[PDB]
Amino acid sequence: GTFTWTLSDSEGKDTPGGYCLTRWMLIEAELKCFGNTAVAKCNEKHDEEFCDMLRLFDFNKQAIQRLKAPAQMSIQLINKAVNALINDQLIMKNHLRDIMCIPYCNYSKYWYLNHTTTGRTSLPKCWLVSNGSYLNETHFSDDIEQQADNMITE
Amino acid sequence: GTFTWTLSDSEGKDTPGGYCLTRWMLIEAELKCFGNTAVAKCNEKHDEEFCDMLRLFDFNKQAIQRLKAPAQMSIQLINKAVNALINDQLIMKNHLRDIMCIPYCNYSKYWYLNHTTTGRTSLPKCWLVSNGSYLNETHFSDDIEQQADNMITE
Amino acid sequence: GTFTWTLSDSEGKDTPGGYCLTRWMLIEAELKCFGNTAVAKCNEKHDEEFCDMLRLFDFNKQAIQRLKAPAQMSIQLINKAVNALINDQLIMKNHLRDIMCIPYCNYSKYWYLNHTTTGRTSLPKCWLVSNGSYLNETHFSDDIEQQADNMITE
Amino acid sequence: SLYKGVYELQTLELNMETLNMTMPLSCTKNNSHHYIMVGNETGLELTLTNTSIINHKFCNLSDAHKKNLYDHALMSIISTFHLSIPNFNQYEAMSCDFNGGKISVQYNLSHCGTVANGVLQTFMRMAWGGSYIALDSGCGNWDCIMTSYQYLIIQNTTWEDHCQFSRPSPIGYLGLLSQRTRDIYISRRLL
Amino acid sequence: SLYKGVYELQTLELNMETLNMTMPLSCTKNNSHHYIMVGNETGLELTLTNTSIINHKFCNLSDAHKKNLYDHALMSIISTFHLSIPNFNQYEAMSCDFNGGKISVQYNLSHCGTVANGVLQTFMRMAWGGSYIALDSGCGNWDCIMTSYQYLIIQNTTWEDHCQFSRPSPIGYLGLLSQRTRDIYISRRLL
Amino acid sequence: SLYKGVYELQTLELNMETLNMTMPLSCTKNNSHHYIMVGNETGLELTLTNTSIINHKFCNLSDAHKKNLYDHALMSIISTFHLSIPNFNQYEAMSCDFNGGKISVQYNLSHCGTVANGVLQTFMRMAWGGSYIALDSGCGNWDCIMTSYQYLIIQNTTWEDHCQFSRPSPIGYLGLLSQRTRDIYISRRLL
Numbered sequence A, B, C: 001g002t003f004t005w006t007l008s009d010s011e012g013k014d015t016p017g018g019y020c021l022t023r024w025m026l027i028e029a030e031l032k033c034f035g036n037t038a039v040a041k042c043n044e045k046h047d048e049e050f051c052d053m054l055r056l057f058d059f060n061k062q063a064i065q066r067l068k069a070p071a072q073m074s075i076q077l078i079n080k081a082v083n084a085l086i087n088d089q090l091i092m093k094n095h096l097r098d099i100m101c102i103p104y105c106n107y108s109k110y111w112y113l114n115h116t117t118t119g120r121t122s123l124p125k126c127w128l129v130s131n132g133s134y135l136n137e138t139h140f141s142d143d144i145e146q147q148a149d150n151m152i153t154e
Numbered sequence D, E, F: 001s002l003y004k005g006v007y008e009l010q011t012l013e014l015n016m017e018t019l020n021m022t023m024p025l026s027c028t029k030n031n032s033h034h035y036i037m038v039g040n041e042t043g044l045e046l047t048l049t050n051t052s053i054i055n056h057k058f059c060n061l062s063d064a065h066k067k068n069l070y071d072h073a074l075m076s077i078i079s080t081f082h083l084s085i086p087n088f089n090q091y092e093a094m095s096c097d098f099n100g101g102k103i104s105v106q107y108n109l110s111h112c113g114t115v116a117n118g119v120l121q122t123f124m125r126m127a128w129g130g131s132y133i134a135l136d137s138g139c140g141n142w143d144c145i146m147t148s149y150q151y152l153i154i155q156n157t158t159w160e161d162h163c164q165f166s167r168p169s170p171i172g173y174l175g176l177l178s179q180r181t182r183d184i185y186i187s188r189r190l191l
């Protein structure tokens, strides 16, 4: 009924929490680490695409490591375990926004605010698409303002 | 998984994030608007029938507005989109309460508090029934008192 | 959807809330009452096995009390009602942690802190198992310390 | 009614007729007749009755599917209803007639742990608004649910102001959408 | 065992025996025998064994449904078990005998990516607590788990104190309810 | 771009091709050819075309299951696709051929209530990354979705760098897993 998979990237960090996307998990980018204050929101938020993608990447990493691979690959594991990693109704929302000509998240690009001197970051939010065109950073500038206010509150 | 559909009603309002039920969505009543503080609770809580109904009405409005109508009506859209709008296990709880002779919500009638001078309101809670009879406003007067005690702290 | 079943063990108590595991719901035949503060977290959190078990035990009590037993047993009521009582994807998480040689909850044993003088207790958390042996308390002592910090905070 | 001196209690009643275009809405007229309107101009009528309309034991769904001729929404509702029946194992209990594209299903409800019990259980969830007056007890009984009526007849019909006893609601159908294929028995090694 | 001076660590263990009146309870006696108790009366015995009992390739589910001599809860458990098998495509692997209302199902397990792996895959989840000893490895191997036994036999049985290795728990059964029909192959163009 | 004087807007793009060892990934080359990749070395090519490769109306799923010469992940994807079609009732519309273990399915798409709409709805969700260019209208039509192409042909293929128009993504397939058997019609009284 609800995702339950927990992220674990505590080794070698200054805080037990947080999660890091390596250069293999990212397109034309280096290592990117997000702290506990942002990643901890994924435990509760039910409408964040980035959190679902983090659970997918973490599950993939632990699955290729801790389970013996068969000779020819099977998709049984994800077929059972998808509902513990992601909210499929979030994908349904993005599909509904797509067919109704509303901007929607295709699960590729995300944006976040990074503090200049501290390095603290927000939980990334998805960059929306309409007919193959990304939004132009002015279509949701007030959301960016609200996110900056949220981090200033913290 | 979990509901994700978001309500969109901000034009002409003193603040964004509220939602307004028009005269057509109500039995023998006029337009009624609920502020951002009450409607925003629908994004988190999982046991409010009124929030499910708001998402249903909003989805109906958007579907009639934005999607081309077929020649003959088809229910494929709701059959695909229902789990993103409502908690079907809330319906299951209400039906379980019905068969167990416990008061249950039939999703028809709701009650809210309304401050006389400021006009601020709580999120409407469902008025329960049992064998066709509504509760008589004394069966849950302590719930109303607790709800009133919750708004004074805000 | 997500779980919605509400616990009701308020009569005769000091405060309107909490839940009591009676002598028959526990090994070693003891009565264990948990206050409103601990049990109230079951309404929100989606990753607590103990809360799912509380909903199962309460549903068993209510179903035995309020529904006429058939002459031959039927498992028809639990089949429909399971998704309103438990998060099946929490069971999926524990199965996934089982098959990857990670410690997992089998839903049998739980641990909680208990204040010496006030009698206040936390929400019980599951005692994990790996292979055929329970974990020592030293394997998760930092979690116990964090729970003690959380109780001191409130 | 004022609480804390400043908070007045006020009430709502939602008009779910406006949801007719996007979702099926179910309601009750009286004890025997119940309805599921699919928008306007079409719907299903569920009657608990002692008068049978089908005297044979055929349900030629394959021929109906080949010919089409039926409203796809109504057949979807029938499929949801049938797949929501738990532990259905008597094929002669259900007979059908889809000649000319119509829909006409008949469940023979002729005490505990029977096909009539499961059919009545799905019936009262498909029409959850006002079905409780139709059943013998209406409460405290799930597994041994029963009705004096011998047949449940589901027929396609036209839109009229049927909702006399209970208001229209999509809640029953939307609830039953998750119950599909959850309690169906296996009839083959390969489904 | 005190933490922060005043907080004492304490533990509880749930007695899930009391859930027998509402739901199945699955648990393990030894590596070769597992059980799914329904009520204080009935249930299923699941044995991994090298000894056949059916010795033919028939599974007459339709005739059993016609006669209706079986326990509906046990057949529901059997249907959930079969529909939870991922990628089942060899009907000959499953044999059945429902003569007189009994239940006697047999899966032929006679390395990676075939029907025996799927049968064991559903078996170790249907009795989650304590089925790990029955397999070659408790963990590390998932996509092809194996056991030396050649047959899995599911038979209706009466109630007895069977769990000597693991406590009764509904979690194994309740987990598989959502797994039904998620990995079944299509056998017909109209299902 | 600085907000509030000190907060710099920054972006990241996820490389979901690294998810290939655990789940399928869907992408689009051009408006007609779309791909599903199950790891490396295998996958399905979904092609909208006016050229049919199957002239018969057989599909013979049971024989393919009995011989068991096919890739199980690809057949699982085909089963998910077919069971995700809403209101499929024309069995002659879908032909297929699994001789020798290959996979080759052909949906006959030859404007609101036909099987072509349901097939296209499932198609544009299985390949959600770039299927909008494959349709007559990018958005605003769901019940009356159409394409000028007359056939949708799904054939097993090898891995190459096809993902030209849209990036690889598992989102479509993972979304359609909950859609299996949700909008199917009943063909037999006992499923």
Ligand SMILES: *[C@@H]1O[C@H](CO)[C@@H](O[C@@H]2O[C@H](CO)[C@@H](O[C@@H]3O[C@H](CO[C@H]4O[C@H](CO)[C@@H](O)[C@H](O)[C@@H]4O)[C@@H](O)[C@H](O[C@H]4O[C@H](CO)[C@@H](O)[C@H](O)[C@@H]4O[C@H]4O[C@H](CO)[C@@H](O)[C@H](O)[C@@H]4O)[C@@H]3O)[C@H](O)[C@H]2NC(C)=O)[C@H](O)[C@H]1NC(C)=O
Pocket (backbone or CB within 6 Å): F029, F030, F031, F032, F033
């Ligand atoms: C959307 O994206 C798809 C996928 O990329 C794309 O499909 C491809 O289209 C191209 C162009 O139509 C196809 O290219 C032709 O394919 C044939 C078939 O051979 C292929 O397959 C065999 C195995 O079955 C392979 O062994 C072989 O190497 C090819 O991969 C080829 O025969 C064609 O080559 C000949 O014609 C070319 C001109 O098109 C010549 O340049 C080439 O030298 C070859 O000459 C031959 O043909 C001459 C007559 O034309 C003849 O006189 C010569 O004697 C000689 O026989 C060519 O490669 C390709 O197969 C398609 N691939 C797939 C996966 O479908 C769509 O076209 C694209 N659509 C859009 C909107 O752009």
Ligand SMILES: *[C@@H]1O[C@H](CO)[C@@H](O[C@@H]2O[C@H](CO)[C@@H](O[C@@H]3O[C@H](CO)[C@@H](O)[C@H](O[C@H]4O[C@H](CO)[C@@H](O)[C@H](O)[C@@H]4O)[C@@H]3O)[C@H](O)[C@H]2NC(C)=O)[C@H](O)[C@H]1NC(C)=O
Pocket (backbone or CB within 6 Å): B106, B107, B108, B109, B129, B131, B132, B133, B134, D128, D129, D130, D161, D162, D163, D164, D165, D166, D167, D168, D169
């Ligand atoms: C939830 O529970 C409540 C309380 O049990 C329930 O309220 C009842 O609903 C019915 C149906 O609307 C009401 O019956 C109506 O009563 C008026 C009295 O003036 C009649 O005029 C109505 O009949 C006319 O209108 C109908 C609808 O258009 C026509 O079909 C009919 O031919 C007439 O023109 C109708 O009989 C009943 O009064 C209320 N009772 C209470 C206490 O409010 C509600 O329906 C339930 N809702 C759901 C979603 O199930």
Ligand SMILES: *[C@@H]1O[C@H](CO)[C@@H](O[C@@H]2O[C@H](CO)[C@@H](O[C@@H]3O[C@H](CO)[C@@H](O)[C@H](O[C@H]4O[C@H](CO)[C@@H](O)[C@H](O)[C@@H]4O)[C@@H]3O)[C@H](O)[C@H]2NC(C)=O)[C@H](O)[C@H]1NC(C)=O
Pocket (backbone or CB within 6 Å): C106, C107, C108, C109, C129, C131, C132, C133, C134, E128, E129, E130, E161, E162, E163, E164, E165, E166, E167, E168, E169
């Ligand atoms: C969760 O994991 C734990 C740890 O692995 C696991 O605990 C084990 O449970 C089994 C089953 O109860 C215990 O085995 C018991 O051990 C005592 C030893 O004195 C025996 O007396 C018990 O046998 C008697 O009772 C049985 C049940 O009525 C009878 O069938 C039998 O004939 C005897 O009368 C029984 O063998 C085992 O001791 C614990 N081990 C630990 C480490 O605690 C627990 O079962 C798992 N739970 C679930 C839900 O899977």
Ligand SMILES: *[C@@H]1O[C@H](CO)[C@@H](O[C@@H]2O[C@H](CO)[C@@H](O[C@@H]3O[C@H](CO)[C@@H](O)[C@H](O[C@H]4O[C@H](CO)[C@@H](O)[C@H](O)[C@@H]4O)[C@@H]3O)[C@H](O)[C@H]2NC(C)=O)[C@H](O)[C@H]1NC(C)=O
Pocket (backbone or CB within 6 Å): A106, A107, A108, A129, A131, A132, A133, A134, F128, F129, F130, F161, F162, F163, F164, F165, F166, F167, F168, F169
């Ligand atoms: C989500 O929406 C965005 C925006 O619509 C969308 O971004 C587009 O993705 C495609 C696919 O990656 C990009 O196409 C690439 O463009 C570059 C331009 O230089 C080409 O070089 C690429 O082709 C090379 O690599 C391919 C394999 O990746 C090879 O097959 C090919 O032969 C070449 O070697 C490729 O065409 C496109 O540029 C972006 N556009 C934008 C605006 O960023 C994204 O794909 C969508 N994601 C999902 C999951 O749907």
Ligand SMILES: *[C@@H]1O[C@H](CO)[C@@H](O[C@@H]2O[C@H](CO)[C@@H](O[C@@H]3O[C@H](CO)[C@@H](O)[C@H](O)[C@@H]3O)[C@H](O)[C@H]2NC(C)=O)[C@H](O)[C@H]1NC(C)=O
Pocket (backbone or CB within 6 Å): D052, D054, D055, D056, D108, D110
């Ligand atoms: C619905 O189901 C009931 C049974 O549950 C059907 O009634 C049964 O009908 C058969 C005939 O088809 C009856 O058998 C007959 O019994 C009489 C008297 O013994 C005998 O003279 C006849 O030769 C024949 O054997 C059976 O008794 C009767 N049972 C009941 C409970 O009435 C009913 O026909 C079904 N209705 C439909 C429309 O399918």
Ligand SMILES: *[C@@H]1O[C@H](CO)[C@@H](O[C@@H]2O[C@H](CO)[C@@H](O)[C@H](O)[C@H]2NC(C)=O)[C@H](O)[C@H]1NC(C)=O
Pocket (backbone or CB within 6 Å): B024, B064, D017, D018, D019, D020, D021, D039, D040
């Ligand atoms: C079905 O719902 C529609 C939409 O809510 C109703 O149509 C509305 O009817 C009112 C009253 O006549 C009009 O003022 C609105 O403009 C209509 N809206 C639209 C979008 O058409 C319709 O009345 C309902 N049908 C039935 C039979 O109850």
Ligand SMILES: *[C@@H]1O[C@H](CO)[C@@H](O[C@@H]2O[C@H](CO)[C@@H](O)[C@H](O)[C@H]2NC(C)=O)[C@H](O)[C@H]1NC(C)=O
Pocket (backbone or CB within 6 Å): D029, D030, D031, D032, D033
């Ligand atoms: C419930 O309402 C229906 C519909 O009005 C009643 O059936 C009608 O009964 C009258 C009187 O016999 C007939 O003239 C009509 O043709 C019937 N209509 C239909 C659609 O069948 C039915 O009798 C009512 N039930 C009860 C128990 O009062």
Ligand SMILES: *[C@@H]1O[C@H](CO)[C@@H](O[C@@H]2O[C@H](CO)[C@@H](O)[C@H](O)[C@H]2NC(C)=O)[C@H](O)[C@H]1NC(C)=O
Pocket (backbone or CB within 6 Å): D099, D100, D101, D102, D103, D156, D157, D158
């Ligand atoms: C049930 O559906 C059938 C088939 O659509 C209806 O019969 C059709 O009625 C229309 C007019 O509404 C005629 O033009 C068609 O020729 C009829 N078809 C056949 C095959 O006779 C029937 O009226 C519906 N039933 C009810 C009670 O409304």
Ligand SMILES: *[C@@H]1O[C@H](CO)[C@@H](O[C@@H]2O[C@H](CO)[C@@H](O)[C@H](O)[C@H]2NC(C)=O)[C@H](O)[C@H]1NC(C)=O
Pocket (backbone or CB within 6 Å): C024, C064, E017, E018, E019, E020, E021, E039, E040
């Ligand atoms: C099945 O569970 C029921 C309770 O749901 C158990 O019955 C209880 O047994 C204890 C011990 O004898 C009694 O004190 C209780 O009063 C009984 N409760 C009820 C409601 O009858 C029963 O023992 C369990 N069965 C098995 C085989 O363990």
Ligand SMILES: *[C@@H]1O[C@H](CO)[C@@H](O[C@@H]2O[C@H](CO)[C@@H](O)[C@H](O)[C@H]2NC(C)=O)[C@H](O)[C@H]1NC(C)=O
Pocket (backbone or CB within 6 Å): E029, E030, E031, E032, E033
């Ligand atoms: C697991 O336990 C069962 C019974 O508890 C054992 O099977 C029994 O074997 C004895 C000795 O041959 C027979 O008399 C009984 O009839 C058998 N019982 C049943 C139910 O089959 C079985 O051998 C045990 N397995 C192991 C490995 O110890």
Ligand SMILES: *[C@@H]1O[C@H](CO)[C@@H](O[C@@H]2O[C@H](CO)[C@@H](O)[C@H](O)[C@H]2NC(C)=O)[C@H](O)[C@H]1NC(C)=O
Pocket (backbone or CB within 6 Å): E052, E054, E055, E056, E057, E108, E109, E110
């Ligand atoms: C279970 O399956 C095995 C493997 O197919 C069957 O054993 C085969 O039986 C045939 C027919 O007698 C022999 O020709 C093969 O040599 C056997 N193969 C092996 C590997 O032993 C076995 O008969 C099946 N069991 C049942 C009860 O049907």
Ligand SMILES: *[C@@H]1O[C@H](CO)[C@@H](O[C@@H]2O[C@H](CO)[C@@H](O)[C@H](O)[C@H]2NC(C)=O)[C@H](O)[C@H]1NC(C)=O
Pocket (backbone or CB within 6 Å): E099, E100, E101, E102, E103, E156, E157, E158
């Ligand atoms: C499995 O079920 C069958 C059928 O119910 C049981 O056999 C029946 O047992 C009852 C008494 O419990 C007798 O009255 C019936 O006559 C028996 N039927 C037949 C066809 O023989 C059987 O005992 C059960 N198996 C076990 C191991 O308990």
Ligand SMILES: *[C@@H]1O[C@H](CO)[C@@H](O[C@@H]2O[C@H](CO)[C@@H](O)[C@H](O)[C@H]2NC(C)=O)[C@H](O)[C@H]1NC(C)=O
Pocket (backbone or CB within 6 Å): A024, A064, F017, F018, F019, F020, F021, F040
């Ligand atoms: C499929 O995913 C795997 C796993 O992420 C990718 O393999 C990685 O490839 C990179 C670049 O060669 C290596 O640095 C990693 O060490 C590899 N990891 C593993 C576990 O093999 C693989 O590249 C992906 N497939 C494709 C076609 O890109």
Ligand SMILES: *[C@@H]1O[C@H](CO)[C@@H](O[C@@H]2O[C@H](CO)[C@@H](O)[C@H](O)[C@H]2NC(C)=O)[C@H](O)[C@H]1NC(C)=O
Pocket (backbone or CB within 6 Å): F099, F100, F101, F102, F103, F156, F157, F158
């Ligand atoms: C689709 O699958 C078939 C069957 O696996 C592939 O054909 C096989 O190819 C292998 C080598 O890769 C040969 O050893 C087999 O003999 C072939 N079988 C048959 C029946 O021809 C086929 O190559 C795949 N299609 C594509 C386009 O790659």
Ligand SMILES: *[C@@H]1O[C@H](CO)[C@@H](O[C@@H]2O[C@H](CO)[C@@H](O)[C@H](O)[C@H]2NC(C)=O)[C@H](O)[C@H]1NC(C)=O
Pocket (backbone or CB within 6 Å): F052, F054, F055, F056, F108, F110
């Ligand atoms: C796909 O379906 C079309 C019809 O929708 C078939 O074309 C028809 O073929 C018949 C003879 O079989 C002709 O009488 C019709 O005139 C054709 N109709 C059209 C519109 O062309 C076509 O054969 C089917 N294709 C396959 C491969 O089965």
Ligand SMILES: *[C@@H]1O[C@H](CO)[C@@H](O)[C@H](O)[C@H]1NC(C)=O
Pocket (backbone or CB within 6 Å): A032, A033, A034, A114, A115, A116, A119, A121, F010
């Ligand atoms: C944020 O900015 C700092 C600037 O030094 C950089 O080091 C860090 O990697 C950035 N973090 C993220 C998540 O982009």
